């Protein structure tokens, strides 16, 4: 009956900062603690074993340290490719009596300069209109930060409780994001109007991309 208390749950830093993750053991696991990194959609990769030993093919800016029952994983110079979730694994002996314990995990976001999105808008296709439902999708490509106020207008009338948003994970190269806002209506509600638009607000700027039914 052993538990791994990981801290913190998440943290943001800029490229070059020094970040620290801590793992507290319920009892004493001696040195049998390992650190792993997991990227979205992927299985974790072994970063550090036996508290302070480096794996094969892991850069030197990952380090591990032990102080009794407190284990520390340090990223000395954060790089844009370190965006992941980090876990500790402690094993009391053979794992019996729930001796194998994972940490809660730490999600590491990356702080960078503000970058404006490229905004596209796609009307619903006729193939989808044949079924009595219309989804118009607003795409925001390569922006930062993740925060962005995306609103919908139909005939310059603001919409609420009518769309759904989805965010990609932070890009592994330029630490950027991509957002999709899908506005769903019935075929009748789509035919009842003409001008559709999505407005993206990011600080002091608010760019609106639009299209009108029929004409083009």
């Amino acid at each position: 009956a052993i538990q791994m208390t990981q801290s913190p749950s998440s943290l943001s830093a800029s490229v070059g900062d020094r970040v620290t993750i801590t793992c507290q053991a319920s009892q004493s696991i001696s040195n049998q603690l390992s650190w792993y990194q997991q990227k979205p959609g992927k299985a974790p990769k072994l970063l550090i074993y036996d508290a302070s030993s480096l794996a094969s093919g892991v850069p030197s800016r990952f380090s591990g340290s032990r102080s009794g029952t407190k284990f520390t994983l340090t990223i000395s110079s954060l790089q844009p490719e370190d965006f992941a979730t980090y876990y500790c694994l402690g094993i009391y002996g053979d794992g019996a009596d729930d001796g194998i314990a994972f940490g809660g995990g730490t999600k590491v976001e990356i702080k960078r300069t503000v970058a404006a999105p490229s905004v596209f808008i796609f009307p619903p296709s006729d193939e989808q209109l044949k079924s009595g439902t219309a989804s118009v999708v607003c795409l925001l490509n390569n922006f930062y930060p993740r925060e962005a106020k995306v609103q919908w207008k139909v005939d310059n009338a603001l919409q609420s409780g009518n769309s759904q948003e989805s965010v990609t994970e932070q890009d592994s190269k330029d630490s950027t994001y991509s957002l999709s806002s899908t506005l769903t209506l019935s075929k009748a509600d789509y035919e009842k109007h003409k001008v559709y638009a999505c407005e993206v607000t990011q600080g002091t700027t608010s760019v609106t991309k639009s299209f009108n039914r029929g004409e083009c």
Binding site: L46, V137, S180, C216
Partner: protein
Amino acid sequence: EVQLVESGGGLVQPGGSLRLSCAASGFSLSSYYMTWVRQAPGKGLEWVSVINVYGGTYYASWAKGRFTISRDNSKNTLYLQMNSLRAEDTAVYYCAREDVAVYMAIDLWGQGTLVTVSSASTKGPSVFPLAPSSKSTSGGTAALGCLVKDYFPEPVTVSWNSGALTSGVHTFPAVLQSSGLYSLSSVVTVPSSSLGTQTYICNVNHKPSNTKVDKKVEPKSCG
């Protein structure tokens, strides 16, 4: 050259059973401890089961006598049989190799398989085109994509031109709609002068329903 490939998993009704398998390539799993580790959606890693080099099986408290880990040495494959599945059992299950003689850690994993325990029924997706528009698209670049709507359960896999188009491709995570069905989009940016001469086909795969959709996205004109 050393891999663990997992198969099995999909939609299972509560109280129903399922069997996951993990084929090893490049080594014999009979020489290592092997492990099954799960992860529920948006949560942490949860240890499930371990099998010894002798064949001794260790399980967890919540899955004691309910699951069964095994290995076939002739086929060189690990197995996890699940019998009394509950709603809290939906998760991505991973097969992992434990190196207790050197690392005292896990040095090899496999891609996960998603097991969804639910009473809902399997439904295939509808794939509509997000058509590229005229050359009024932020310069020389254009945006096109596929809208994958009304499917269940997860996951869906999208690719473009059978894996030939990868750069500038964004497949958004799925969103649970009010209807209990999922929906997502996959968009790609291309040079605007590519339209008309280069074809763009999105490849939607939905293994839970054994459905595969290839939709050629074509430009929508004006007039």
